[PDB]
From Swiss-Prot, chain A:
Family listed: Belongs to the BAF family.
Residue numbers bearing the N-acetylmethionine modification: 1
Effect seen on changing residue 9 to A: Reduces binding to dsDNA, LEMD3/MAN1 and histone H1/H3. Reduced interaction with PARP1
Effect of residue 25 to E: Complete loss of dsDNA, EMD, histone H1/H3 and LEMD3/MAN1 binding
Consequence when changing residue 29 to A: No effect on histone H1/H3 binding
Entry domain remark: Has a helix-hairpin-helix (HhH) structural motif conserved among proteins that bind non-specifically to DNA. LEM domain proteins bind centrally on the BAF dimer.
Name used for this protein in its record: Barrier-to-autointegration factor
Involvement in disorder: Nestor-Guillermo progeria syndrome: An atypical progeroid syndrome characterized by normal development in the first years of life, later followed by the emergence of generalized lipoatrophy, severe osteoporosis, and marked osteolysis. The atrophic facial subcutaneous fat pad and the marked osteolysis of the maxilla and mandible result in a typical pseudosenile facial appearance with micrognathia, prominent subcutaneous venous patterning, a convex nasal ridge, and proptosis. Cognitive development is completely normal.
Gene name linked to the record: BANF1
Outcome of swapping residue 14 to A: No effect on LEMD3/MAN1 and enhances histone H1/H3 binding
From Swiss-Prot, chain B:
Residues modified as N-acetylthreonine: 1
Organism: Homo sapiens (Human)
Protein name: Barrier-to-autointegration factor
SMART domains, sorted: BAF
Superkingdom, taxonomy of origin: Eukaryota
Gene name as annotated: BANF1
Subcellular location: Nucleus; Chromosome; Nucleus envelope; Cytoplasm
Length: 89, 88
């Protein structure tokens, strides 16, 4: 298993009302920037992932433009949403 | 009161179900939703979630996007709300 424990914690269960910082790759700095843009719960970011039809390029660019995430952060956040979706959607 | 279409949708994960599986989304609305890129049910779920599950704003967005009437938008919102309570 190459993923972080944080990714595994997130994909193991429905997300409910978890904050955005529960997503892999979303540390406190990115999380604050997301929350002040309205993306305060993990499910709101999931929403954007889904409206972008799960496209990696579009979603990772969106995250970069919205909170300044770097390549590793956006990869981790995308992969964590992708696997959550495969498990629960 | 609800339709069997609603209950069937809220009973299980939606996976790749087409947009026409949503309660309220008939053949006419579905086509218009597909034309605008909302071809699968989960894309409409996505919009519901980006709008933080706000009933008024989601139902208005649906009217603006595919022309849904009050009952169609009621039915569609309600089935996404109950699906989310079960699975999200």
């Amino acid at each position: 298993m190459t993923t972080s424990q944080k990714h595994r914690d997130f994909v193991a269960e429905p997300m409910g009302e978890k904050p955005v910082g529960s997503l892999a790759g979303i540390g406190e700095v990115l999380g604050k920037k997301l929350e002040e843009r309205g993306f305060d719960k993990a499910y709101v970011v999931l929403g954007q992932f889904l409206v972008l039809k799960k496209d990696e390029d579009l979603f990772r660019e969106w995250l970069k433009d919205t909170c300044g995430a770097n390549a590793k952060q956006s990869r981790d956040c995308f992969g964590c949403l992708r696997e959550w979706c495969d498990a629960f959607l």
